[PDB]
Amino acid sequence: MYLLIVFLPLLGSSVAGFFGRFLGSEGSAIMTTTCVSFSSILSLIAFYEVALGASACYLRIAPWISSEMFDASWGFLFDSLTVVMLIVVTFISSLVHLYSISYMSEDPHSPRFMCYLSIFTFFMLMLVTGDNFLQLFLGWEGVGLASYLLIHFWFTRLQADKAAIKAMLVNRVGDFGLALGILGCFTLFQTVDFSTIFACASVPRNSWIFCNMRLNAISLICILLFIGAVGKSAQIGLHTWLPDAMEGPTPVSALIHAATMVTAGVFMIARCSPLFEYSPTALIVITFAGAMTSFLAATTGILQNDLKRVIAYSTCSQLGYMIFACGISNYSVSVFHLMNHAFFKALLFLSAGSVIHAMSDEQDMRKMGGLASSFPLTYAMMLIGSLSLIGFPFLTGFYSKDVILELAYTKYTISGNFAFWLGSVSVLFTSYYSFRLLFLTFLVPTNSFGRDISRCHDAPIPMAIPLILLALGSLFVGYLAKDMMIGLGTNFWANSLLVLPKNEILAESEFAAPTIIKLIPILFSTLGAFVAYNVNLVADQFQRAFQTSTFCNRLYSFFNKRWFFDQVLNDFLVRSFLRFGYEVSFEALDKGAIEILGPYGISYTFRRLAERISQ
Amino acid sequence: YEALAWLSGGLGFFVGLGLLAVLNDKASKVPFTPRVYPYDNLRVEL
Amino acid sequence: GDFRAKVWSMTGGPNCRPKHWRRNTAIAMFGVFLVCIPIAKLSAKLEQRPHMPVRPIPSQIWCKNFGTKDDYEKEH
Amino acid sequence: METNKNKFIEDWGSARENLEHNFRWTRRNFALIGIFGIALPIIVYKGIVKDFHMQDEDAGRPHRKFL
Amino acid sequence: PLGTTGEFFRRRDEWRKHPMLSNQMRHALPGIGIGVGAFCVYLVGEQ
Amino acid sequence: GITYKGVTVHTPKTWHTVTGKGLCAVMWFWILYRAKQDGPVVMGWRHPWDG
Amino acid sequence: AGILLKFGTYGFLRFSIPMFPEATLCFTPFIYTLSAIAIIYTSLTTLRQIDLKKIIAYSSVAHMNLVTIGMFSLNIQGIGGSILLMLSHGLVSSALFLCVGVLYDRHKTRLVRYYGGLVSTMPNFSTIFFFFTLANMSLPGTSSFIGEFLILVGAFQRNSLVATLAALGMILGAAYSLWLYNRVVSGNLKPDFLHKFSDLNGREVFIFIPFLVGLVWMGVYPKVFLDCMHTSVSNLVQHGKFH
Amino acid sequence: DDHLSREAVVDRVLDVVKSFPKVDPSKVTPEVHFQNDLGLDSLDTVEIVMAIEEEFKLEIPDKEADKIDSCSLAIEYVYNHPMS
Amino acid sequence: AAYFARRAAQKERVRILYRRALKDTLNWAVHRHIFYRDASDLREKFNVNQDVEDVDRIDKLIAHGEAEYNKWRHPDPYIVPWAPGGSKFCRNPTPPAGIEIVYNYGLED
Numbered sequence A: 001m002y003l004l005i006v007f008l009p010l011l012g013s014s015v016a017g018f019f020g021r022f023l024g025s026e027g028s029a030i031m032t033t034t035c036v037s038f039s040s041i042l043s044l045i046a047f048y049e050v051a052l053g054a055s056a057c058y059l060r061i062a063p064w065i066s067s068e069m070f071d072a073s074w075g076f077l078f079d080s081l082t083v084v085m086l087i088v089v090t091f092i093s094s095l096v097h098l099y100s101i102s103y104m105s106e107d108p109h110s111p112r113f114m115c116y117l118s119i120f121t122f123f124m125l126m127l128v129t130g131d132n133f134l135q136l137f138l139g140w141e142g143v144g145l146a147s148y149l150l151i152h153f154w155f156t157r158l159q160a161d162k163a164a165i166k167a168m169l170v171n172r173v174g175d176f177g178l179a180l181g182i183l184g185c186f187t188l189f190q191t192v193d194f195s196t197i198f199a200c201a202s203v204p205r206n207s208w209i210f211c212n213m214r215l216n217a218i219s220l221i222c223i224l225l226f227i228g229a230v231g232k233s234a235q236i237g238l239h240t241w242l243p244d245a246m247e248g249p250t251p252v253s254a255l256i257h258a259a260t261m262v263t264a265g266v267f268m269i270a271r272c273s274p275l276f277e278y279s280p281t282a283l284i285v286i287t288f289a290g291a292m293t294s295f296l297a298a299t300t301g302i303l304q305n306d307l308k309r310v311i312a313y314s315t316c317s318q319l320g321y322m323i324f325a326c327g328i329s330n331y332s333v334s335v336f337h338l339m340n341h342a343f344f345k346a347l348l349f350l351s352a353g354s355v356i357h358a359m360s361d362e363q364d365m366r367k368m369g370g371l372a373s374s375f376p377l378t379y380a381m382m383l384i385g386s387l388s389l390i391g392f393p394f395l396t397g398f399y400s401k402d403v404i405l406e407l408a409y410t411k412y413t414i415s416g417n418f419a420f421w422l423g424s425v426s427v428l429f430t431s432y433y434s435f436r437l438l439f440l441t442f443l444v445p446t447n448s449f450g451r452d453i454s455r456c457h458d459a460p461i462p463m464a465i466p467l468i469l470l471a472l473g474s475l476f477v478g479y480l481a482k483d484m485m486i487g488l489g490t491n492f493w494a495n496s497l498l499v500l501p502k503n504e505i506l507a508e509s510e511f512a513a514p515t516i517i518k519l520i521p522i523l524f525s526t527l528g529a530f531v532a533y534n535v536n537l538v539a540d541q542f543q544r545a546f547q548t549s550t551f552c553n554r555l556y557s558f559f560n561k562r563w564f565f566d567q568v569l570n571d572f573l574v575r576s577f578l579r580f581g582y583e584v585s586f587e588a589l590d591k592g593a594i595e596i597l598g599p600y601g602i603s604y605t606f607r608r609l610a611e612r613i614s615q
Numbered sequence B: 001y002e003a004l005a006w007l008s009g010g011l012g013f014f015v016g017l018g019l020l021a022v023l024n025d026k027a028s029k030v031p032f033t034p035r036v037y038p039y040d041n042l043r044v045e046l
Numbered sequence C: 001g002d003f004r005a006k007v008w009s010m011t012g013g014p015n016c017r018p019k020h021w022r023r024n025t026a027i028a029m030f031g032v033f034l035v036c037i038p039i040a041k042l043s044a045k046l047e048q049r050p051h052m053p054v055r056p057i058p059s060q061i062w063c064k065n066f067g068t069k070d071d072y073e074k075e076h
Numbered sequence D: 001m002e003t004n005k006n007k008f009i010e011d012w013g014s015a016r017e018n019l020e021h022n023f024r025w026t027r028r029n030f031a032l033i034g035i036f037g038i039a040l041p042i043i044v045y046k047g048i049v050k051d052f053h054m055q056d057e058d059a060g061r062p063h064r065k066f067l
Numbered sequence E: 001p002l003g004t005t006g007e008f009f010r011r012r013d014e015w016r017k018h019p020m021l022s023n024q025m026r027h028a029l030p031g032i033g034i035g036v037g038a039f040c041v042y043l044v045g046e047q
Numbered sequence F: 001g002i003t004y005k006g007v008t009v010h011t012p013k014t015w016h017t018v019t020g021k022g023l024c025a026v027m028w029f030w031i032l033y034r035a036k037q038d039g040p041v042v043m044g045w046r047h048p049w050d051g
Numbered sequence G: 001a002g003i004l005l006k007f008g009t010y011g012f013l014r015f016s017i018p019m020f021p022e023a024t025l026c027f028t029p030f031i032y033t034l035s036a037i038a039i040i041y042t043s044l045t046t047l048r049q050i051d052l053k054k055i056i057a058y059s060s061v062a063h064m065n066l067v068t069i070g071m072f073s074l075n076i077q078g079i080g081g082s083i084l085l086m087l088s089h090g091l092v093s094s095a096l097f098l099c100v101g102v103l104y105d106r107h108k109t110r111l112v113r114y115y116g117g118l119v120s121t122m123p124n125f126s127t128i129f130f131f132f133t134l135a136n137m138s139l140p141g142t143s144s145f146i147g148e149f150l151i152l153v154g155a156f157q158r159n160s161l162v163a164t165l166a167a168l169g170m171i172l173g174a175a176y177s178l179w180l181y182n183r184v185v186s187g188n189l190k191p192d193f194l195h196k197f198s199d200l201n202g203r204e205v206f207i208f209i210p211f212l213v214g215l216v217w218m219g220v221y222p223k224v225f226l227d228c229m230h231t232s233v234s235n236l237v238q239h240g241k242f243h
Numbered sequence H: 001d002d003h004l005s006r007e008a009v010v011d012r013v014l015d016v017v018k019s020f021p022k023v024d025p026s027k028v029t030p031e032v033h034f035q036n037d038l039g040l041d042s043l044d045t046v047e048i049v050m051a052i053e054e055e056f057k058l059e060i061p062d063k064e065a066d067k068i069d070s071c072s073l074a075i076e077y078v079y080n081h082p083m084s
Numbered sequence I: 001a002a003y004f005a006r007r008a009a010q011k012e013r014v015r016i017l018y019r020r021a022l023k024d025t026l027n028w029a030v031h032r033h034i035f036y037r038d039a040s041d042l043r044e045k046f047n048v049n050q051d052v053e054d055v056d057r058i059d060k061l062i063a064h065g066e067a068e069y070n071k072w073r074h075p076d077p078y079i080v081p082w083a084p085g086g087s088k089f090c091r092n093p094t095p096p097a098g099i100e101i102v103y104n105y106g107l108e109d
C-alpha cells in the first residue's frame, strides 16, 4: 500500500515511454493520469493513516551502500511532514496531468511529455519519502535532471537549450553545496540517516579545520546545506534560472516551477529541523537571504510585461518569504505557507496557460485588452489565485501572509528588523504587479489583434476541472488547515519538527503584537491596488509612459533587466571561465611546453645529431 | 562595466540598510521577559 | 514528418495514433495491475509502524506489524 | 552515407589540431604559463600541507616532516 | 485625434469597441451581484 | 457568433459563465460569513474569550 | 580507456600502498595537489574541444585522476570507492567510446559541429547516448555516483581542502557533459551534409544491453561488489600500521 | 491553417488604403504605387505597412519593409508567407 | 552632383528610423488611446524640418536622430511569437526537405 505511491508513476512512465507506440498519443496520457490519480488516492489514504491517526510507518527495502558504517538503505520515512508534502505533490501532479491532456493535445510529442513528468514525480516522491541524505540526494538530483529535461522539451529551440544548460549549471552549484553538506554530516555523526543525527545532534560542540580556519561543525554543515539549497530554493546566491526557464511548456512551469521543487530546499531544511536549530549563526543568514530574495523578486517583477515571466518573480518572492519563515524556527508556518501557495500559484499559472492556449500564445500584456466576459471562468480562477496571492483577509492567503510578518516583528534582533522591513515593503510591489496583470489584461480597452480575438475557443473540459479543484482548494484549505497545523500547540508535528523552547515566538506573538501591524499589510495591499489602478486606468499618460532623457529611463532599464545581474554574472563568471578554459590551458599547457621540450619539440636532437658520429 | 556598479551599488543599499538595522538596535527593546518553564527550564528534557 | 515516418521512435513518432490503441491501453492497465500486486504484497510484508493508531485506520487489514518496535533493546 | 565535409571546416579543425606551430615564448604568455605551471601548484601544496599541520596541531601530535 | 496619424489608427480599429467588450468595468466582480444578496438573505433569515 | 466590422467571437459557453458567476457568489458569501464570525478577533475588537 | 588506465591504479593498490606505507604518508600532499590540478585543468580544457574523440578522452583523464585522490587516502571508504569508480569508468568510458565509434563509422567526420539535431532520425541511439552521458554525470542510481561519492567521503576523512577541489571538478564535469550532449542530439537538423544515415542495427543495439544492465546493477545495488572486497581493502589499509 | 486564397485577402489589404483619407478612397487600385499615382510622402507609406502589420499578425523584417511602396507587393508578401 | 546615390541613404535611413521609432513608441504606449498623441508627436518631429537641401544639414541630423534613438531602446520590445525572436519560432518546425534513411546496414558480406 505504502510502497505503491512512489512506484506507480515510475512504472507507468516506464511502460508509456518504452511502448509509447502501442498506447498512442492519448492512451499514454490517460494512463499516466490514471496512475498518478491512484497514487494521489493512496497518498490521501496514507495521510489519513498517518496524520490524523498519528503513527509514523517506517519500511526498509534493502541496503544501498553497505560499507563501513555508511549504511544508506532504501528505507522510507513517512511522518506528518512527509504526508502533508505528498498530498500536495501527487495531487498537483495528477491535476496537472489532467490539465495537460487537453493542453498538450495539438502537440506531436504527447507521450514523451507524460513520461517525463511521471518519472519526475517518481523522483520527487523518492525525495520526500527518503529516510537518509543519499536517498534524498538521489531524488533531489533526479528532480533537477527532470526539470532540465522539461526545459529542453523542444530541443530545436536554441534559446531553450541555453536556458536548460544554465539551469543545470546553477543546479550543479547547488549539488556541490548539498553534497558537501551531506558528506560533512557523515564525518561528524558517522551516519547519514535522519533518525540518528536528530537523536544525537546536540552532543558535539567541536570546531573543524575546514581548509581555511577553525569553524564549528554544526554551523559549517548548516551553511553548506544552505549553499546546497540556494540553487533549488532559488535564493540570492543563484536564482537567475527561473525567469529564463519559462521558455518550456506552461504546465511544467505551472506544475513544478511554482509548487514543490522551488520549495524542495524548503522541505529539506524543514525536514532537518533539529540540525539548523543548534546553529543560531545559520538562521541569521537564512533570514537575511529570505528577506534579500523577497525584496529582489518583488522589485524586479513590477516592470515586466510578459505573461509567463512576470509570475515567476512572484514565485521567487514567495520562496523568499518561505525561507524567511524557515529562518525563524517556525517551519510549521513555513509549511503552512507552502501548502497555501501550492494551490493558488498553480491555479494562477493554469489559468494563464488556459488563456494563452486560446489566444494562440501571445504572452505580452501590451496586447491583451478587455475581453474578460469572453473568458469568465478563467477570470474567476485567476482572481481567486491572485486574491490568495495578496493575502486577502479571511482567505487562504491571509492565514499565512500576515502571520509571517507578525512573527517577523515579534523577534528582536538586528536582522529581524531588517527582514521585517523588507517583508512589509515587498507587499506593495507584489500587490502592484499582481494587480497590473489583471489590469493590463482583461480590464483595459482591447489592443489584441483580430486574428486572436476571432479564435475564442474557451477552455474545454479536460483543463477546466483541475482549475475548479484548485479554485475550491485555495478558498477553504487555508481555513481548514490553520487550526490543524498551527493551533498554538497542536499534536501534528510529534517527530516532523523540533521547536526550540527559546526560539518559540508563537504564543507571545498573537497577544503582544499591536493591532495596527495586524492590519498594515491590508493597507499596503490596498495602496498597491490603488496605485495600479491609477497607473493602468486613469493616470497612464506620464505615470506609465515617461519620455525622460536620463536618470529616469535608466531606472526603467534597471528593474526590467533584473538589476543587470543576468548580464554581470554571465560576463564575470561564465564568460571568464569559457575564455580561460582554453586560453591558458590549451595554449600554454598540454600540447606545448610539455611538447616542445618533451617528446618531439626540441628534444629530438638525434636527427640533428645523426650526421656527426659517422666522421 | 556600467552594469557592474549596480551590483555593488545594489548590494551597497542592502548593507547600508543592514547598517541601519545595526544602528537601530532592535534586540534590546523587547517588551517581554525571557521565557520561564518548569523543571529548571526543562533541564531533564534537554 | 516526411522522413519521420521511417524512424522507429520507441516512445512513438510525431503523431502515431495507431489503429488499435484502446486494446493496448487496456492490456497496459492489466499489466500494471499485475506487476503492482507483488509490490503491494512486499509492502504489507515489511512495514513496522511502531505506534498503535489512535483510531482504526484502513491499515491492519493486510499489515500485521503494529507496536512491534516498543522493545528497543533486542535490536540488531 | 559519408558527409559532404565542406572545405571551410577541416582547415580550422587542423589549425586546432596543429596549434603546436604557433608558440614563440612571448613575455605575457611566459608569465601566464609560469603562474599556472608553478605558482598555483605551490599555492595549493601549501594549502594541503598547512591543512594537515593545523589538523595535527589540535590533536597535539608532532607534525610529520612531509618531504 | 488630430495629428495626421492618430486619427488614422482610430479609424481602422473602431472594431476595438465591440460594445459587449468595450468597457468590462461592470463585471470586475461578477459574483457580487448575487453573493451579497445571498449573504444578506442568510443574515436576515437565520435571525 | 456575430461580427462588428470584421471581427467575430464565439459566444461564451453557458456551462462556463454560470459556474463562474455562482462560484464567485459563493466565495463572496464565504468571505462575508468569515468576516461576520471572527472579524473582531483579528481586528482586536474582541478576544476569543481568553482574558 | 577500459583496461590500460587501470594498470597504474592497480599497480598503486598492489606494489605501492602496502610496501611503502610511511612513504605514502610523506608523499600524500603532493599527489593531492597533482590530482586536483589535473582535474581542474582537464575540466577547463575539455569544454572547448571540437574533436569527437578527445571530448570524452579528457573525461577519462579527469575520472582517473579523481580515482587517485581516494586511492591514496588510506581509508576503507576511499579505496573501496576507488575500485568502484574504476569499474564504473571502465564501463561508462567504454560505452561512450562505442557510441563515438558507431557515430564515426557511418559519417566518418571525427568532428562535433557536423552532427546536430539527429534525435528525430536516430531515437534509439539518442536514448542510449543520453543514458551513457547520464551515467558519466554520476547520478545516484548510476554506476559512477556510489564510487565517486565514496572517494569524496574517504578523502574528507583525511583532508578537507584538496577533495573539495575534486568535488568542484564535478561542478563543471556535469555541465560540459550535458553541453556536449546538446551539441549533437538537440537543435534543428542540417541536411546539407547529412543526406543519408541510419540507426543502430541488431548488433549494436544488443551490445549496449550488457552495459545498461551492468550500469543499473552498479547503481541500485552495489552491495554484492562491496561484499567481496571489504576484507581485502581493510587488510590493505591496515598493513604496516601496528599500534 | 485554412490557407486563405488571394480573393479572401484582396479586401482587407485594400481596407487600410481605403481608410487612408489623405488620398481619395475612390481611385485606389490593387495595383498602385503610393509614390507617384496616389501622391504620398516618403514617410506616411510605412504607416500603411505597419497598419497591415496590426491587421495581419506577421512580422515583416526591417530589410525589405521599406521596399514595399506598391500595394501589389504587400498582398504578395503576406500571401507568400505560409503561416500568414 | 545630380547623383541619387548620395541622396539615397538619407531616404531609407529616415524611413527605417520612422518605422523603428513607431515600433518602440508602440512598445512604450501599452494603451492605444494614449498612443495616438504619441504617434502624432512622433510624426510631427520627423516633419519639423522636412525641407533640407544642403549636404551639410543631412548627415549630422540623421546621426543626431540615431544617437538619440540609441538612448531609447525599450529593453523588451514586442516580438511576434513565430517571428525570429518570439516565443513560438522554431517550436514545432516543419521537417527539412529531403533526407533518406537506409534499413539494411552492417550485414554479412
Ligand SMILES: CCCCCCCCCCCCCCCCCC(=O)O[C@@H](COC(=O)CCCCCCCCCCCCCCC)COP(=O)(O)OCC[N+](C)(C)C
Binding pocket: A010, A011, A013, A014, A017, A018, A109, A112, A115, A116, A119, A122, C004, C007, C009, C010, C011, C012, C013, C014, G118, G119, G120, G121, G122, G123, G124, G126, G127, G130, G131, G134, G135, G139, G140, G141, G142, G143, G219
Ligand atoms: C543513471 C540513470 C538513472 C535512471 C535515469 C532514468 C531517467 C530516464 C532516462 C531516459 C530519459 C529519456 C531521454 C531519452 C532521449 C530524449 C530524446 C529522445 O530520443 O527520445 C526518444 C525516446 O523517448 C523517450 O524518452 C523514451 C525513453 C524512456 C523515457 C521514460 C524513462 C522511464 C524509465 C526510466 C525510469 C524508470 C524508473 C526508475 C528505474 C529504477 C524519442 O522521442 P520521440 O518522442 O519518439 O521523438 C521522435 C523523434 N523524431 C521527432 C525525430 C521522430
Ligand SMILES: CCCCCCCCCCCC(=O)SCCNC(=O)CCNC(=O)[C@H](O)C(C)(C)COP(=O)(O)O
Binding pocket: A548, A549, A550, A553, H041, H042, H043, I010, I011, I012, I014, I015, I017, I045, I046, I047, I049, I050, I051, I052, I061, I062, I064, I065, I066, I068, I069, I071, I072
Ligand atoms: C531618450 C532619448 C531622447 C528622445 C529621443 C528622440 C529621438 C528623436 C529623433 C529625431 C530624428 C529626426 O528628427 S529625423 C527627421 C529627418 N527629416 C528629413 O530628413 C527631411 C528630408 N526631406 C526630404 O528629403 C524631402 O523633402 C522628401 C524626399 C520629400 C522627404 O522624404 P524623406 O522623409 O524620405 O527624406
